[PDB]
Amino acid sequence: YGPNAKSMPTEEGIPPSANDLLLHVLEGVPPPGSRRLVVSGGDARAWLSNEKMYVRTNLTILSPGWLASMTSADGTHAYEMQKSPVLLVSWHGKVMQLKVEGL
Amino acid sequence: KETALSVGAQAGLAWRAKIIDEQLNKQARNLDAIYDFNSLVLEHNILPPVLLEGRNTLNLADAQSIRISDRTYKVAKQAHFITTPPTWRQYLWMDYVKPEAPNVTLLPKTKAEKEIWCIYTERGWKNGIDQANTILEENIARIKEDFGGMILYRKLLAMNMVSPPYVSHTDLGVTGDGSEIHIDDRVLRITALPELNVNSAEWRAAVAK
Amino acid sequence: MDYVKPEAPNVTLLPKTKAEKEIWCIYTERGWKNGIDQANTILEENIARIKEDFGGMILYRKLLAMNMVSPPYVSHTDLGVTGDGSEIHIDDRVLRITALPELNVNSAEWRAAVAK
Amino acid sequence: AKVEKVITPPSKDNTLTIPNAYNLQARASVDWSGPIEELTARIAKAAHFRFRVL
Amino acid sequence: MKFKKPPINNPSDDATIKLAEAAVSVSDSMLEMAKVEKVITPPSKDNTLTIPNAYNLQARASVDWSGPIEELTARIAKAAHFRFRVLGKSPSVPVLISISTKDESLAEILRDIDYQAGKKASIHVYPNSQVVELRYAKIY
Amino acid sequence: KFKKPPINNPSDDATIKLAEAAVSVSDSMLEMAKVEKVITPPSKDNTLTIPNAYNLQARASVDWSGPIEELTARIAKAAHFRFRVLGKSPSVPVLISISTKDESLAEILRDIDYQAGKKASIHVYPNSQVVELRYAK
Amino acid sequence: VPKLPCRVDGACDATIIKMMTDLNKKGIKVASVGQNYLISIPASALFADQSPRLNWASYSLLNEIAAFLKQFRKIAITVTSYSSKYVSVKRERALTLARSRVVSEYLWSQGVDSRIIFTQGLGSDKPITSYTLGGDRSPNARVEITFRRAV
Amino acid sequence: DGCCSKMGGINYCDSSAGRLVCNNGFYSTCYCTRHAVMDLQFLMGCCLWHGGVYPQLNSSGLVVCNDGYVSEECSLQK
């Protein structure tokens, strides 16, 4: 390699599979260094570590768009998400909103 | 206001944790009956590790870039030794002191400050109770995570997805000088940590009835 | 629409006689009308925006039926098992789209429609 | 959606139907994600059927 | 003209509630694991040919024990009027036995002890000479 | 005229589910351990039975932790039996350890053979009053 | 907490108890056991003689049913109709189907809070009383609604 | 206020359910924790369905959500 030594990435490679913190999120263990949040309106829990939300429920969020979704072996959905004041959830064929406090 | 809020939070946290510890001690035998670690230990007093599994994974990096998979597995903590089995006391028991002396700084002298002192201490008490409940939820999550990991490892060992830990022993006879002696010297090492296998064809399915 | 009620009207000046009280009343009323019209203007700008986006996507569906737009192309590549003995993924697939939908310039292959 | 939907009539769709063998009617439970030969061999072994691959 | 439902009992606590709601899921997973392991591993034999039940062994017992093994076996043999015997050597880390049951046989209790022991210790019975034999593993 | 309910009784909705979960877990683990453990019939049990000759019915207190041949030779010497050995001692000696107060030499020999494991065995002859130490290879 | 909700809107168990007392003393059968709830109505106070038509006074009772059904949170309501043997099979089937459809569509148009309404009629195949002396005055010709309370 | 009124009274709460337990076995209409099903459709706040309020301190009246969107309704008149 010379002075410039630009090793050119002609092929980028595989995009990342999943952030592995979602497993402990799925089991309810918060990631280290994170902090607790306040969720009201339903049954869910949430965490904030690196300006990125993690949320845990068994319901289905609709509105704000998520980035990674993990499913347990029995019907529990955990989401790696952006931060939001509020989420839109279809619970049982009916649409509700769940607000989030802690931002 | 805020002083009452602080001392109410402290008193509620302490008292709620006290009642929680009393109930936890009252329900005693079924606890460790449920969490029998000492059944789970392998042949050479070695703790089987913790495994995490996932279903139906997907990531989006950006436009025209996603990646999907069906199942994932991951070792969390490596298998190692245990001179003694663990228990739940390090997972569920919590600390308790008795705060006792809030000094005379903001004592309520009139009716309005008396009643707001009462209700503000009351709501701080509720808040501390809620915080203790959150703490218990986190502990429950931790112990469930660890126990699920070891039972999942036993499952995959039955399924032939993991190599068993490989041990080794070296035996020595007499040892030491003419002043210090040991009778027989047996050395126990573990030469292969357990890990997944990637060869598909060795994997055995199971069928119930 | 974002709504937070403000409950702090900061007070600098006060009327003294009936004339300034009356002009205070009528100017507050005029401001009330102005704020109402501001809210309506914000509403109609928003409704134009959503109408624009919806018209755009239904236009794309229409023109793809018209056969003037190339539909987007995506490969998916499958892999077997992956990862070492530390952690594993069972069957990976990666989907990449390469053809962004463009507009043709070759007018011969254009399709018309007729009705009844 | 009525225009866009593609169907196939069930006269000639390619899917194995129920062979209604009596020993094939038992109940079980399974969980598997991987190869196909091991699972099919285990299923036939539970069914007391001989199993082969072309 | 009042209205009720049947189960009207004393109040509970949310912490106990969450404890039980964890425990049911753990029990489900353990049941699944046990079913899978049973149907994949064919059992072969039984410990009853090793441990037959003889007379003066049907006096019953109800127990609650969470400690070591050897003196507990000595106590139950002393209740049996049987001579007790140990072979091999006890290891450095002691064997831990936790048994919580009620009102069954000495023979079934001993079989439960042997099954809880598993890969480390074993119990044998000599009825012609009324001998309770404990034998450790040949390892370490 | 008075019969109490049990003191530690699960008279609560959380407690009954917790107790049912407990007994379920216990039964499942019992099944798991029972199907996991191996056994062996006494027909092929590899333990030397009791020779029960009258010269071996003495009682003694024994403290030893060391090699094997001198110990069993002294056992035979106190038992007034001749002792011989077929085989050869390897470089690493065979080690044993017994400390006890009151039993007979027959079960002492039984514990000797059980502690020896695969490397050695013993044989008793009361017709010709001898013990044999058989090494492995 | 002055802003956050304290209870469900328009819900009061005292009103629930009072109106179920009034319903059962009116003779419309109100049944509650476990987490399922049944309301059964004789057809004689609702329709004409084996005929799909609605008495004008019956709408007060119908609105009472609506006021009860607003007090609960549910998913699905099933309304079933049964009648007595009159001519055939098919006539009884059609009569039950029409009666159930009419009462279901009126309840949907009124302010009930549901997601799913199932409606069906079975003619006369499921009697609850062998005393078949009377005509429509016998209580087996009836209309029932069942639902399970949601959390 | 009265949750199990015209019943025996309040017994306890099920936080897994979010409803109180009356003396009869009937689930009351009150709530006993925030972790319960709330039919929610209208709420306060601003920068909703956006990145929330950007936490910078502004001398001007520019209130801008974290996605770059600027909400003059949340802001003030000039």
Side-chain angles (χ1 to χ4, degrees), chain E residues 63-80:
Chain E
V63 90
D64 169 53
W65 198 281
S66 166
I69 157 179
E70 299 92 336
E71 35 79 34
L72 176 55
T73 63
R75 289 219 173 204
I76 192 171
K78 186 188 71 74

PDB file of all heavy atoms in Angstrom, chain E residues 63-80:
ATOM      1  N   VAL E  63     -41.964 -35.410  54.843  1.00  0.00           N
ATOM      2  CA  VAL E  63     -40.636 -34.858  55.037  1.00  0.00           C
ATOM      3  C   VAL E  63     -40.561 -33.447  54.468  1.00  0.00           C
ATOM      4  O   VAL E  63     -41.396 -33.027  53.666  1.00  0.00           O
ATOM      5  CB  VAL E  63     -39.576 -35.785  54.400  1.00  0.00           C
ATOM      6  CG1 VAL E  63     -39.312 -35.420  52.948  1.00  0.00           C
ATOM      7  CG2 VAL E  63     -38.305 -35.790  55.210  1.00  0.00           C
ATOM      8  N   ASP E  64     -39.558 -32.699  54.934  1.00  0.00           N
ATOM      9  CA  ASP E  64     -39.166 -31.444  54.290  1.00  0.00           C
ATOM     10  C   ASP E  64     -37.680 -31.222  54.554  1.00  0.00           C
ATOM     11  O   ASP E  64     -37.297 -30.827  55.657  1.00  0.00           O
ATOM     12  CB  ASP E  64     -39.986 -30.272  54.791  1.00  0.00           C
ATOM     13  CG  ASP E  64     -39.419 -28.960  54.336  1.00  0.00           C
ATOM     14  OD1 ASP E  64     -39.215 -28.799  53.117  1.00  0.00           O
ATOM     15  OD2 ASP E  64     -39.148 -28.098  55.191  1.00  0.00           O
ATOM     16  N   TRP E  65     -36.856 -31.462  53.540  1.00  0.00           N
ATOM     17  CA  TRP E  65     -35.411 -31.452  53.704  1.00  0.00           C
ATOM     18  C   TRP E  65     -34.759 -30.693  52.561  1.00  0.00           C
ATOM     19  O   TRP E  65     -35.152 -30.848  51.404  1.00  0.00           O
ATOM     20  CB  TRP E  65     -34.868 -32.867  53.743  1.00  0.00           C
ATOM     21  CG  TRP E  65     -33.525 -32.948  54.303  1.00  0.00           C
ATOM     22  CD1 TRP E  65     -32.365 -32.652  53.680  1.00  0.00           C
ATOM     23  CD2 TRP E  65     -33.183 -33.388  55.607  1.00  0.00           C
ATOM     24  NE1 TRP E  65     -31.309 -32.859  54.518  1.00  0.00           N
ATOM     25  CE2 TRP E  65     -31.789 -33.318  55.712  1.00  0.00           C
ATOM     26  CE3 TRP E  65     -33.920 -33.824  56.702  1.00  0.00           C
ATOM     27  CZ2 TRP E  65     -31.118 -33.671  56.862  1.00  0.00           C
ATOM     28  CZ3 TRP E  65     -33.252 -34.183  57.843  1.00  0.00           C
ATOM     29  CH2 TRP E  65     -31.862 -34.109  57.914  1.00  0.00           C
ATOM     30  N   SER E  66     -33.756 -29.882  52.885  1.00  0.00           N
ATOM     31  CA  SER E  66     -33.071 -29.092  51.870  1.00  0.00           C
ATOM     32  C   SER E  66     -31.571 -29.020  52.121  1.00  0.00           C
ATOM     33  O   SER E  66     -30.959 -27.957  52.023  1.00  0.00           O
ATOM     34  CB  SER E  66     -33.652 -27.687  51.799  1.00  0.00           C
ATOM     35  OG  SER E  66     -32.785 -26.845  51.062  1.00  0.00           O
ATOM     36  N   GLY E  67     -30.944 -30.140  52.445  1.00  0.00           N
ATOM     37  CA  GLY E  67     -29.541 -30.108  52.777  1.00  0.00           C
ATOM     38  C   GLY E  67     -28.711 -31.182  52.106  1.00  0.00           C
ATOM     39  O   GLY E  67     -28.962 -31.576  50.965  1.00  0.00           O
ATOM     40  N   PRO E  68     -27.687 -31.665  52.808  1.00  0.00           N
ATOM     41  CA  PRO E  68     -26.889 -32.781  52.289  1.00  0.00           C
ATOM     42  C   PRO E  68     -27.619 -34.105  52.407  1.00  0.00           C
ATOM     43  O   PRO E  68     -28.775 -34.148  52.835  1.00  0.00           O
ATOM     44  CB  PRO E  68     -25.631 -32.753  53.164  1.00  0.00           C
ATOM     45  CG  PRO E  68     -25.641 -31.422  53.820  1.00  0.00           C
ATOM     46  CD  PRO E  68     -27.070 -31.072  54.000  1.00  0.00           C
ATOM     47  N   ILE E  69     -26.948 -35.198  52.067  1.00  0.00           N
ATOM     48  CA  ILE E  69     -27.612 -36.445  51.738  1.00  0.00           C
ATOM     49  C   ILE E  69     -27.388 -37.519  52.799  1.00  0.00           C
ATOM     50  O   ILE E  69     -28.341 -38.186  53.222  1.00  0.00           O
ATOM     51  CB  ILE E  69     -27.142 -36.919  50.345  1.00  0.00           C
ATOM     52  CG1 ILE E  69     -27.321 -38.422  50.159  1.00  0.00           C
ATOM     53  CG2 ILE E  69     -25.702 -36.513  50.108  1.00  0.00           C
ATOM     54  CD1 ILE E  69     -26.896 -38.903  48.806  1.00  0.00           C
ATOM     55  N   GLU E  70     -26.146 -37.660  53.272  1.00  0.00           N
ATOM     56  CA  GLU E  70     -25.705 -38.892  53.924  1.00  0.00           C
ATOM     57  C   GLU E  70     -26.389 -39.109  55.261  1.00  0.00           C
ATOM     58  O   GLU E  70     -26.885 -40.206  55.544  1.00  0.00           O
ATOM     59  CB  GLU E  70     -24.193 -38.867  54.119  1.00  0.00           C
ATOM     60  CG  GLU E  70     -23.401 -38.765  52.840  1.00  0.00           C
ATOM     61  CD  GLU E  70     -23.088 -37.335  52.456  1.00  0.00           C
ATOM     62  OE1 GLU E  70     -23.830 -36.420  52.877  1.00  0.00           O
ATOM     63  OE2 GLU E  70     -22.090 -37.127  51.735  1.00  0.00           O
ATOM     64  N   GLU E  71     -26.438 -38.071  56.090  1.00  0.00           N
ATOM     65  CA  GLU E  71     -27.065 -38.223  57.390  1.00  0.00           C
ATOM     66  C   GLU E  71     -28.575 -38.382  57.266  1.00  0.00           C
ATOM     67  O   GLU E  71     -29.196 -39.024  58.116  1.00  0.00           O
ATOM     68  CB  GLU E  71     -26.687 -37.044  58.279  1.00  0.00           C
ATOM     69  CG  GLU E  71     -26.553 -35.749  57.524  1.00  0.00           C
ATOM     70  CD  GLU E  71     -27.894 -35.150  57.243  1.00  0.00           C
ATOM     71  OE1 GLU E  71     -28.776 -35.321  58.103  1.00  0.00           O
ATOM     72  OE2 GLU E  71     -28.083 -34.558  56.163  1.00  0.00           O
ATOM     73  N   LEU E  72     -29.171 -37.852  56.197  1.00  0.00           N
ATOM     74  CA  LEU E  72     -30.592 -38.074  55.961  1.00  0.00           C
ATOM     75  C   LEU E  72     -30.871 -39.536  55.633  1.00  0.00           C
ATOM     76  O   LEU E  72     -31.832 -40.129  56.154  1.00  0.00           O
ATOM     77  CB  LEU E  72     -31.076 -37.158  54.840  1.00  0.00           C
ATOM     78  CG  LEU E  72     -32.525 -37.317  54.394  1.00  0.00           C
ATOM     79  CD1 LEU E  72     -33.456 -37.178  55.566  1.00  0.00           C
ATOM     80  CD2 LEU E  72     -32.854 -36.280  53.360  1.00  0.00           C
ATOM     81  N   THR E  73     -30.026 -40.136  54.796  1.00  0.00           N
ATOM     82  CA  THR E  73     -30.159 -41.565  54.535  1.00  0.00           C
ATOM     83  C   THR E  73     -29.888 -42.394  55.781  1.00  0.00           C
ATOM     84  O   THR E  73     -30.518 -43.441  55.979  1.00  0.00           O
ATOM     85  CB  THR E  73     -29.211 -41.981  53.429  1.00  0.00           C
ATOM     86  OG1 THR E  73     -27.868 -41.763  53.869  1.00  0.00           O
ATOM     87  CG2 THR E  73     -29.470 -41.146  52.203  1.00  0.00           C
ATOM     88  N   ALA E  74     -28.965 -41.937  56.628  1.00  0.00           N
ATOM     89  CA  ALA E  74     -28.707 -42.626  57.887  1.00  0.00           C
ATOM     90  C   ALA E  74     -29.925 -42.587  58.796  1.00  0.00           C
ATOM     91  O   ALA E  74     -30.263 -43.593  59.431  1.00  0.00           O
ATOM     92  CB  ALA E  74     -27.499 -42.012  58.588  1.00  0.00           C
ATOM     93  N   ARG E  75     -30.605 -41.439  58.850  1.00  0.00           N
ATOM     94  CA  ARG E  75     -31.809 -41.320  59.665  1.00  0.00           C
ATOM     95  C   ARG E  75     -32.912 -42.240  59.167  1.00  0.00           C
ATOM     96  O   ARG E  75     -33.577 -42.913  59.968  1.00  0.00           O
ATOM     97  CB  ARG E  75     -32.302 -39.877  59.676  1.00  0.00           C
ATOM     98  CG  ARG E  75     -31.427 -38.948  60.461  1.00  0.00           C
ATOM     99  CD  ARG E  75     -32.230 -37.941  61.232  1.00  0.00           C
ATOM    100  NE  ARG E  75     -31.362 -37.174  62.112  1.00  0.00           N
ATOM    101  CZ  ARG E  75     -31.771 -36.560  63.211  1.00  0.00           C
ATOM    102  NH1 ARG E  75     -33.034 -36.603  63.594  1.00  0.00           N
ATOM    103  NH2 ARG E  75     -30.888 -35.893  63.946  1.00  0.00           N
ATOM    104  N   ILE E  76     -33.103 -42.307  57.848  1.00  0.00           N
ATOM    105  CA  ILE E  76     -34.206 -43.131  57.372  1.00  0.00           C
ATOM    106  C   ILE E  76     -33.875 -44.621  57.500  1.00  0.00           C
ATOM    107  O   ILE E  76     -34.762 -45.435  57.794  1.00  0.00           O
ATOM    108  CB  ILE E  76     -34.621 -42.714  55.947  1.00  0.00           C
ATOM    109  CG1 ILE E  76     -35.941 -43.371  55.565  1.00  0.00           C
ATOM    110  CG2 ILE E  76     -33.573 -43.043  54.921  1.00  0.00           C
ATOM    111  CD1 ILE E  76     -36.525 -42.846  54.291  1.00  0.00           C
ATOM    112  N   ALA E  77     -32.598 -44.995  57.397  1.00  0.00           N
ATOM    113  CA  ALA E  77     -32.230 -46.383  57.650  1.00  0.00           C
ATOM    114  C   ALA E  77     -32.398 -46.743  59.122  1.00  0.00           C
ATOM    115  O   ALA E  77     -32.808 -47.867  59.452  1.00  0.00           O
ATOM    116  CB  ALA E  77     -30.796 -46.627  57.200  1.00  0.00           C
ATOM    117  N   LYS E  78     -32.093 -45.798  60.017  1.00  0.00           N
ATOM    118  CA  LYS E  78     -32.278 -46.026  61.445  1.00  0.00           C
ATOM    119  C   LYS E  78     -33.749 -46.208  61.783  1.00  0.00           C
ATOM    120  O   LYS E  78     -34.097 -47.011  62.656  1.00  0.00           O
ATOM    121  CB  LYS E  78     -31.687 -44.868  62.245  1.00  0.00           C
ATOM    122  CG  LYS E  78     -31.708 -45.077  63.749  1.00  0.00           C
ATOM    123  CD  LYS E  78     -31.286 -43.819  64.488  1.00  0.00           C
ATOM    124  CE  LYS E  78     -32.345 -42.729  64.399  1.00  0.00           C
ATOM    125  NZ  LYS E  78     -33.534 -43.010  65.253  1.00  0.00           N
ATOM    126  N   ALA E  79     -34.624 -45.476  61.096  1.00  0.00           N
ATOM    127  CA  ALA E  79     -36.051 -45.763  61.223  1.00  0.00           C
ATOM    128  C   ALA E  79     -36.398 -47.135  60.656  1.00  0.00           C
ATOM    129  O   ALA E  79     -37.307 -47.804  61.158  1.00  0.00           O
ATOM    130  CB  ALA E  79     -36.873 -44.681  60.533  1.00  0.00           C
ATOM    131  N   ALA E  80     -35.678 -47.577  59.630  1.00  0.00           N
ATOM    132  CA  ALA E  80     -35.959 -48.879  59.047  1.00  0.00           C
ATOM    133  C   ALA E  80     -35.414 -50.047  59.852  1.00  0.00           C
ATOM    134  O   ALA E  80     -35.747 -51.188  59.521  1.00  0.00           O
ATOM    135  CB  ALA E  80     -35.387 -48.954  57.634  1.00  0.00           C
TER     136      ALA E  80
END
